[PDB]
């Protein structure tokens, strides 16, 4: 990564490398893995990001999908940002192409040059944006259950049902507030008979906090 | 977080992330998780605080409730602090890290005078977690009664653990609740505690009821 004592490159840490590998092994592509990836890749160069992705041993379907998404974003970058270099200026590198941001056609030293300019070109953050773009798609594709199939069990506590409901909503939607309303209708309709009576009796406008307290004796 | 070298930004540590993730996995929303959260989030920017909350995989019911509480506090901030045209004064959504950049967050925290948007946001998050701790309290303080064979110490441990969660604080309005401790004690110890009189310390109560449990 690039760190402050002036901005310098520092080796990717053994703790960081292991932490990422293990989170992937244990949580796979559960939605929370993505915030963990972004945090573990703080300050990463494109080279560092590629190291993190390549150290994953399994899940090669997901990583192949990720490669395709990266290639799509790289192509869109080049379409919107051609590089006219020719003679590069005295204090400054070349202009980054899509493949340079992804660390495929750029050297580590080139990556550091862009990232450490006083006009900085944040090639690490751009690539991280593309990688997360790919990972989000994988989390949605690999979501095991549709939100329509989350129904409260006969003996399931409302809290456990609500946990399942919003956990599923998080992976399949990848849009926390895009469709919240219709799904707040579904939460009541798909609850089990006992909770449904309590939730219906609460009247209109009950908060989630209020619903969960009211429905604690159920289950 | 923001740390002392001059005040500089530092990436959230891998150790810290795991510590927070694991404490949530192991303790859920037991009341002691909050002092741990505030300490693990020492010096945090709003970005860092959001990262910690987002790395929680489970408990999505609680996390949605937390989002609701944050939105309420953000709205109250805007009502109490309007903003006119280095960026200008923070709005609620900027404090929560939703509409502000990391650089903007660092700018506010290091200004003279400092705008401690991380600490303000941390206050709101704790405000939400307290509500969650209260909601996930499994038992009411009214239902903590000393068992027939339960040692007084074990009953008192159960009593104040629950009292801590239902209050979401270790101590609040506890005088009348020290009356309840005696009334909910078992018959043998209750008689001993009543004879102890007003103003008895817990230490004194535990000594009086020693050996009685058996």
């Amino acid at each position: 990564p690039i760190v402050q004592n002036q901005m310098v490159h520092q080796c990717i840490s053994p703790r960081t490398l292991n932490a990422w590998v293990k989170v992937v092994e244990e949580k796979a592509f559960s939605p929370e893995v993505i915030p963990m990836f972004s945090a573990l890749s703080c300050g990463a160069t494109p080279q560092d990001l590629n190291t993190m992705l390549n150290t994953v041993g399994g899940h090669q379907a997901a990583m192949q999908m990720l490669k395709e998404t990266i290639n799509e974003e790289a192509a869109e970058w080049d379409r919107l940002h051609p590089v006219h270099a020719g003679p590069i200026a005295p204090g400054q590198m070349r202009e980054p192409r899509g493949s340079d941001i992804a660390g495929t056609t750029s050297t580590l030293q080139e990556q550091i040059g862009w990232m450490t300019h006083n006009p900085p070109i944040p090639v690490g953050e751009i690539y991280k944006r593309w990688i997360i773009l790919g990972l989000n798609k994988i989390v949605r594709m690999y979501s095991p259950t549709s939100i329509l199939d989350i129904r409260q069990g006969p003996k399931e506590p409302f809290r456990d049902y609500v946990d399942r409901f919003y956990k599923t909503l998080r992976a399949e939607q990848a849009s926390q507030e895009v469709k919240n309303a219709a799904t707040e209708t579904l939460l009541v309709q798909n609850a089990n008979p006992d909770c449904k009576t309590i939730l219906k009796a609460l009247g209109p406008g009950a908060t989630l906090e209020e619903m969960m307290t009211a429905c604690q004796g159920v289950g | 977080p923001i740390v002392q070298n001059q005040m500089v930004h530092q990436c959230i540590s891998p150790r810290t992330l795991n510590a927070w993730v694991k404490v949530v996995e192991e303790k859920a929303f037991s009341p002691e998780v909050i002092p741990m959260f505030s300490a693990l989030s020492c010096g945090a920017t709003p970005q860092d605080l959001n990262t910690m909350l987002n790395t929680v995989g489970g408990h999505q019911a609680a996390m949605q409730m937390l989002k609701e509480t944050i939105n309420e506090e953000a709205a109250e901030w805007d009502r109490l602090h309007p903003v006119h045209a280095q960026m200008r004064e923070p709005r609620g959504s900027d404090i929560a890290g939703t509409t502000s950049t990391l650089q903007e967050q660092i700018g506010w925290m290091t200004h003279n005078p400092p705008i401690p948007v991380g600490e303000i946001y941390k206050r709101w998050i704790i405000l939400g977690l307290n509500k969650i701790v209260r909601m996930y309290s499994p038992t009411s303080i009214l239902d903590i009664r000393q068992g027939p064979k339960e040692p007084f110490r074990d009953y008192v441990d159960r009593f104040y653990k629950t009292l801590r969660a239902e209050q979401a604080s270790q101590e609040v309005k506890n005088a009348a609740t020290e009356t309840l401790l005696v009334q909910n004690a078992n018959p043998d110890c209750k008689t001993i505690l009543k004879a102890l009189g007003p103003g008895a310390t817990l230490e004194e109560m535990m000594t009086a009821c020693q050996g009685v449990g058996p």
Epitope: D194, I198, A201, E210, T213, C215, G217, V218 | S140
Partner: nanobody
């Protein structure tokens, strides 16, 4: 296991006052939510008031300025105080308790006229 019974309803004048009370078996502090609904024959059941444990009381918009819902834990009773009664207030009023199902009373008749 838990039984509810309303009382306090009757015939009062418009602009009058009335206090309904709902008696509960066991201890009332054990319920996780209580509230009030009303129905007049041919009108759909209407929500009146709600109290969820630990929360402030919520009241319907058609009643907000005039009614109060309270809990008397000493007597184990749930009170709904009605003031400034209107033609819209004629109905049978039911209290609910929540706990594990939920539980309903049989209702009390309230008839408002001048």
């Amino acid at each position: 296991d838990v039984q509810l019974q309303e009382s306090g309803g009757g015939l009062v004048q418009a602009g009058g006052s009335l206090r309904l009370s709902c008696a509960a078996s066991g201890s009332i502090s054990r319920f996780n939510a209580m509230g009030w609904w009303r129905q007049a024959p041919g009108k759909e059941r209407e929500f009146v008031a709600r109290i969820v444990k630990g929360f402030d009381p919520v009241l319907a918009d058609s009643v907000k300025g005039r009614f109060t819902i309270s809990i008397d834990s000493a007597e184990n009773t749930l009170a709904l105080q009605m003031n400034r009664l209107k033609p819209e207030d004629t109905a049978v009023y039911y209290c609910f308790a929540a706990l594990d199902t939920a539980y309903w009373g049989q209702g009390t008749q309230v008839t408002v006229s001048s």
